[PDB]
């Protein structure tokens, strides 16, 4: 009774959108096989489940029909109903006994699609019908990782209500906590952390949860991980410490939080670099003060870079610690030369408080370049500055 317009589409699919009770009754009176498939192994049941009215879905459910049919990609009616989110129709199929445990040809289960798309109500319905919670994708990605990837709080809460494992690693060497931290979803991170995750697990790049949270700058996530008991000073392959990452990124709050819970400062980073070195290189007064207040060693060097930066407050803070002047650079250049040629008058009176510092220039001669000749070359004698300074 069907007319082929070379499209291979049944009248049911075309008439599903403009569904009317009288025309549907007239068509069902004209007995035609409802179980017939389509040119692409589809079924009018799929169209009814997609957007069809409740009445037509209920009528198609009635009488013997192939409820558990596989489409071209192996996606049943339930899979398409969960993916294309619709709490109803899904409700009717689940109450009628549609199989939740069917497996897609792409090795992806309905619960994974429901969690990734974010349809929390479909996730709740599937969980209540006994859909397996600790299942995995074809890469080992549990639904928890998929749900926490985009920070779907309701989906993660509903899935963790069952007791889904967190230590299980998903695709690309990712856990729930790491992917939640990457997206910066604070309450999702709290929800995951409430079930005792193994915080110290590594991602694909080797970056832990704390390192990613610090580099991105999520202060709340960093503090929550610290409260959880994260191993603070795990170093990346770049040689950087999480404190170094926080101070370089420009995160005063994260630096203070990492200092509150006792973290090392004298760590040797890449190419002879420490947290104080990065702070003084960037010249952030609060970061330098916070690091210095915690008693690091100035030797591992900030002296020459601070002198070149010449910021007055950095100079005062670093001089209050008591770093000895005659330390020189790796090239042999004494910081005294660059300190003096810049003509810093404010530092002049501050440099007359210590014996070695008061002697200043006349003490060291390492590279053999006599500074007295250069001083005498200058018409305006520097000695008047020392005389008037006191």
């Amino acid at each position: 009774v069907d007319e082929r317009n070379e499209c291979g589409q049944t009248p049911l699919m075309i008439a599903a959108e403009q569904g009317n009770l009288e025309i549907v009754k007239e068509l069902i009176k004209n007995g035609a096989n409802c179980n017939l498939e389509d040119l692409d192994n589809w079924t009018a049941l799929i169209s009814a489940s997609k957007e069809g009215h409740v009445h037509i879905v209920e009528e198609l459910l009635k009488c013997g029909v192939n409820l558990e049919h596989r489409d071209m990609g192996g996606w049943t009616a339930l899979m398409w109903a969960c993916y294309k989110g619709r709490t109803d129709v899904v409700e009717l199929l689940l109450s009628h006994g549609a199989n939740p445990s069917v497996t897609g040809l792409y090795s992806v289960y309905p619960i994974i699609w429901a969690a990734g798309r974010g349809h929390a109500d479909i996730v709740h319905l599937l969980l209540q019908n006994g859909a397996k919670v600790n299942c995995s994708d074809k890469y080992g990605t549990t639904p928890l990782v998929w749900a926490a990837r985009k920070g779907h709080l309701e989906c993660v809460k509903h899935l963790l209500a069952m007791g889904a494992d967190v230590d299980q690693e998903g695709a690309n060497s990712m856990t729930a906590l790491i992917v939640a931290v990457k997206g910066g979803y604070t309450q999702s991170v709290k929800e995951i952390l409430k079930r005792n995750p193994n915080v110290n697990l590594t991602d694909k790049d080797g970056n832990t949860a704390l390192m990613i949270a610090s580099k991105e700058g999520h202060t709340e996530i960093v503090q929550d991980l610290l409260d959880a008991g994260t191993y603070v000073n795990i170093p990346d392959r770049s040689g950087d410490t999480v404190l170094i990452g926080a101070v370089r990124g420009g995160h005063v709050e994260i630096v203070r939080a990492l200092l509150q819970k006792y973290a090392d400062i004298d760590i040797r980073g890449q190419d002879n670099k420490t947290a104080l070195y990065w702070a003084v290189e960037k010249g952030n007064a609060t970061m330098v003060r916070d690091i210095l207040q915690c008693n690091p060693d100035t030797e591992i060097t900030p002296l020459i870079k601070a002198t070149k930066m010449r910021n007055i407050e950095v100079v005062e803070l670093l001089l209050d610690k008591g770093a000895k002047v005659s330390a020189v650079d790796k090239k042999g250049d004494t910081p005294l030369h660059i300190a003096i040629r810049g003509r810093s008058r404010k530092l002049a009176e501050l440099l007359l408080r210590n014996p070695k510092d008061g002697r200043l220039l006349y003490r060291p001669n390492k590279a053999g370049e006599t500074p007295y000749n250069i001083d005498c070359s200058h018409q305006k004698s520097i000695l008047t500055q020392i005389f008037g300074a006191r």
Partner: protein
């Protein structure tokens, strides 16, 4: 069971003992089918009880195999994780030592670990495939869906199918090698890891090594005895020349076997999958210790015969019996009908010799090529066997017989090349090669005509000398270029950093390649001059001494050629012997970015159009 085409060579027999018994299951099903009572003769109860009897045994066997696979996979997974941890610890220790050759060996260890991970992935996949096919056949034969239900209930939930830690270990190994063993580069790291050493995880049988030591010691002491006896016990008023040619043939055979053992070692360690190229049996092949042992045994026999010739052990037995006894025992050890003394290799070699000598009738595999070319290199053994027949027949060069004996190996490979021309119908690698093995014919023929016409003294003698010299230079240059370009693959335009080499290099160092180039040049010229001199009766002063001193050099050149030709066959498939270029061990594909760009929006698109 058709494991694979490349992984088959890397699979240890203890690995094969732990796979599903596909053949046993199929035989069990066929036995159940064949002995089934019929409904026509017997009632339904008798048939039902027979099928219950069969199904119970079948499912007990399936449960045992499934448990075996689970246990072995758990063991191998734990081993892989432990070895990965150990390798990371070693790498971090090395980095800490350097910041505040072992690195090449560490990359080699990562290559072997990667090979282990690929083998375990193969273990998962083929066992699942075997279960699926066996239970589908069960369903077809007994018409019951119990096979599929049992598969869903037990097989699909088993740890070996569901545990996906091996893929993660593969990805982490690739990441570690890429970011730490080399600079940021994935193509180079994958190129290095994709060619693991073929040598599977088994040592020598611990008695072959002992016998190699035994024969090496006996051979060294016997050689010292030979040197002392020759220095002190010297003949007078006799020609020792008939003995030196015979024992020259024996010596070249022994040295060829020794150097072929070294070639097998080099291929096996460097990563060249010679098992697939030679089309050897992936199970029960021969390592280098076996070849060393055979070479040592034949060396012991050769030294004993030579000493018996120098001394006078038995008064009644004359001197010429010892070469006869030596070669009779060698040929008997080659054509032993029984199953003892390397029966598999001996029968394979006999079949290969039969196919090589009757060349155009048999299809040309890689082994026929390799052994015909080895004959091209070892023609001196054939010539000395001919001389032995001549010297033991006429007494104690009839009409160009020696020239024909020289041209026999070149003819074998010439007609193999023409047969491959008929089969494949490509004129580039076949007719050119035939022209090469015909220029050898021209060399020999013009040298022989020069020798014959020098006695005449006619003015045509200089014309034949000019023909000989031009064909000498043509054949030498032709073979040299063909070697270094098509047989070795060197001098490629694609290599940018390897200079006068090709893109892919298997052997650890490059100086090997260069020194091989120089030695191959000088030794191809020496080989051509050896053929010319030994084919001519120019002068007996240099003759029989030039050939004697240059033959071991020729075998040296040939085993170097073996190294680099097998390397080229593995890498660039220069011969159309197999319809797959990629033998290098690589895992299955991964498309995690396909799940991305899905799961978030309106995918759709499941319809064909």
């Amino acid at each position: 069971m058709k494991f694979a085409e490349h992984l088959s060579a890397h699979i240890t027999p203890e690995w094969r003992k732990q796979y599903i018994q596909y053949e046993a299951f199929k035989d069990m099903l066929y036995s159940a089918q064949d002995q089934a009572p019929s409904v026509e003769v017997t009632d339904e109860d008798t048939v039902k009880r027979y099928f219950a009897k069969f199904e119970e045994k079948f499912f007990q066997t399936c449960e045992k195999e499934l448990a075996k696979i689970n246990t072995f996979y758990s063991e191998k997974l734990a081993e892989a994780q432990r070895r990965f941890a150990t390798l990371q610890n070693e790498l971090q220790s090395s980095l800490d030592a350097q910041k505040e050759r072992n690195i090449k060996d560490l990359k080699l260890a990562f290559s072997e670990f990667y090979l282990s991970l690929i083998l375990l992935q193969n273990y998962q996949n083929l066992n699942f495939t075997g279960f699926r096919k066996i239970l589908k056949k069960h369903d077809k034969i007994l018409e019951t869906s119990r096979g599929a239900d049992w598969r869903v209930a037990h097989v699909e939930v088993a740890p070996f199918y569901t545990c996906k830690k091996i893929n993660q270990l593969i990805s982490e190994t690739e990441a570690v090698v890429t970011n730490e063993l080399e600079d940021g580069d994935r193509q180079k790291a994958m190129k290095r890891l994709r060619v693991p050493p073929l040598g599977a995880a088994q040592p020598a049988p611990a008695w072959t090594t002992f016998r190699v030591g035994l024969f090496c010691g006996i051979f060294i002491v016997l050689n010292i005895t030979l040197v002392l006896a020759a220095v002190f016990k010297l003949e007078t008023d006799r020609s020792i020349w008939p003995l030196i040619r015979i024992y020259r043939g024996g010596f070249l055979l022994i040295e060829f076997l020794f150097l072929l053992g070294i070639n097998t070692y080099g291929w096996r360690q460097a990563g060249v999958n010679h098992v697939l190229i030679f089309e050897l049996n992936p199970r029960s092949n021969l390592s280098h210790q076996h070849l060393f042992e055979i070479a040592g045994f034949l060396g012991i026999l050769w030294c004993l015969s030579l000493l018996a010739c120098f001394f006078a052990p038995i008064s009644v037995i004359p001197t010429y019996v010892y070469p006869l006894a030596l070669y009779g025992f060698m040929v008997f050890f080659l054509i032993n009908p029984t199953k003892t003394f390397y029966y598999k290799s001996r029968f394979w070699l006999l079949k290969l010799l039969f196919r090589v000598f009757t060349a155009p009738f048999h299809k040309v595999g890689f082994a026929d090529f390799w052994l015909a070319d080895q004959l091209n290199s070892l023609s001196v053994i054939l010539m000395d066997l001919e001389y032995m027949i001549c010297f033991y027949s006429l007494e104690l060069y009839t009409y160009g017989v020696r020239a024909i004996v020289q041209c026999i190996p070149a003819w074998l490979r010439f007609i193999q090349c023409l047969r491959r021309y008929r089969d494949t119908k490509r004129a580039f690698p076949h007719l050119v090669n035939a022209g090469k093995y015909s220029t050898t014919f021209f060399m020999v023929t013009f040298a022989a005509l020069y020798s014959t016409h020098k006695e005449r003294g006619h003015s045509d003698t200089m014309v034949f000398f000019y023909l000989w010299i031009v064909f000498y230079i043509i054949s030498s240059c032709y073979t040299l270029i063909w070697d270094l370009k098509m047989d070795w693959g060197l001098f490629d335009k694609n290599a940018g950093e390897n200079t006068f080499l090709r893109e892919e290099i298997v052997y650890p160092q490059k100086a090997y390649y260069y020194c091989a180039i120089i030695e191959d040049v000088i030794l191809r010229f020496a080989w051509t001059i050896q053929i010319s001199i030994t084919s001519t009766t120019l002068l007996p002063h240099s003759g029989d001494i030039i050939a004697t001193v240059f033959a071991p050099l020729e075998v040296f050149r040939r085993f170097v050629w073996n190294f680099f030709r097998l390397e080229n066959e593995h890498l660039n498939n220069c011969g159309e012997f197999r319809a797959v270029r990629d033998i290098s061990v690589a895992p299955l594909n991964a498309d995690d970015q396909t799940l991305l760009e899905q799961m978030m929006d309106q995918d759709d698109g499941v319809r064909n159009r």
